[PDB]
Design a protein around this ligand. Structure first.
Ligand code: ATP
Length: 342
């Protein structure tokens, strides 16, 4: 079959990093997040972040070092860049929300610049090295502190990752965000209790950010670490996002996903075409996959189910085999979890 048709090879020199950077910046400057004031705030934010997105810029050096490190899953450059762009989009949404809650005093250019710079640094930290050990995140933080010019927390030993940037554009510790809950006497060691702490509040913010953009994500880490629990707490805390836990097995097939879809969603005919919508209105059906990487590869190194989620995440839809018709996904997003592949 290789010799039965032509060929073209696209190496990874085809997209220079600056190519992706210019695509992201142009798409942000043109299209608005909601679907105009927020386009104006996007333009201002992009004007702020342009100096760090140039060739031989802060993001490029940070990315090459993150490649020099080790990550729990296979590090792909576009994965890091797409995560960073999604989190920057959420930063712009946060600025828009702050403006909406303060009609008298819209956030000025100086505060916007400070917030965007600090969010960019924190975003690099949590996107490039968010899938590494704590020590490797510390190494990346030390590097980026060495090479960047953005002001950073002056904690003598606390790495920047434990810090957060306030909507007022200031470096504030994540510790203050952690409350002190008093669980009831009969609720000790309960299957649902979630004591807030540094890790779960940071992961709460990250889950909120990557779920607002409807970017699917998978939690990685050693068995019994607080991953499934933190995810469920976040998802239940979510206002209008139903949660559908799904225990993927080694015998998992996309047929199971279709079963869940017909159980919770329904097919309706719209002028664009057949559209998948969850039955209950205004709800982002978040399909939790307990063990995303568990399903077996075939003899040709392909997990059919993960191919299905890739198809639906990228193309924004799938094909209904009943009538071989394109079905677009509406109000559906995915989150998974898995221990390291080792
Ligand atoms: N911050 C916390 N507050 C309360 N309990 C916690 C906290 N962090 C972890 N735990 C407890 O530790 C365990 C963490 O479970 P976890 O959510 O990691 O499971 P899991 O994702 O299903 O595991 P696995 O990968 O082995 O299948 C639970 O028993 C949970 O109650």
């Amino acid at each position: 079959t290789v010799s039965r048709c032509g060929m073209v090879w696209f190496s990874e020199d085809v997209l220079s990093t600056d190519m992706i950077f210019n695509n992201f910046l142009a798409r942000l400057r043109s299209i608005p997040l909601d679907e105009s004031p927020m386009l104006q705030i996007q333009r201002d934010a992009a004007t702020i972040m342009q100096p760090y997105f140039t060739s031989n810029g802060l993001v490029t050096k940070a990315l090459e070092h993150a490649f020099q490190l080790e990550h729990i899953m296979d590090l792909t450059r576009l994965r890091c860049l797409g995560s960073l762009f999604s989190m920057l989009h959420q930063a712009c949404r946060n600025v828009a929300q702050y403006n909406a809650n303060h009609p008298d005093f819209p956030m000025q250019i100086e505060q916007l610049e400070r917030y965007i710079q600090r969010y960019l640094v924190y975003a690099i930290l949590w996107s490039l090295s968010g899938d590494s050990r704590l020590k490797m995140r510390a190494e990346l933080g030390e590097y980026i502190r060495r090479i960047t010019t953005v002001p950073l927390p002056t904690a003598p030993n606390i790495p920047i990752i434990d810090y957060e940037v306030s909507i007022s554009g200031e470096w504030s510790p994540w510790q203050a965000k952690v409350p002190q809950i008093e669980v009831e006497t009969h609720k000790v060691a309960a299957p649902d209790v979630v004591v807030p702490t540094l890790d779960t509040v940071r992961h709460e913010a990250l889950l909120y950010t990557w779920l607002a953009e409807h970017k699917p994500l998978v939690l990685c880490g050693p068995p019994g670490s607080g991953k499934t629990m933190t995810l469920f707490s976040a998802l239940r805390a979510l206002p209008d996002m139903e949660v559908v836990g799904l225990n993927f097995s080694s015998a998992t097939t996309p047929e199971l996903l279709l079963k869940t879809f017909d159980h919770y969603c329904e097919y309706r005919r719209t002028p664009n075409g057949v559209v998948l919508a969850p039955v209950q209105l205004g709800k982002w059906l978040v399909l939790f996959c307990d063990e995303i990487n568990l399903p077996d590869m075939d003899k040709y190194g392909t997990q059919r189910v993960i191919s299905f989620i890739r198809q639906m995440v990228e193309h924004g839809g799938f094909y209904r085999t009943s009538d071989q018709t394109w079905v677009k996904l509406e109000r559906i997003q995915f989150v998974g979890a898995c221990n390291p592949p080792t």
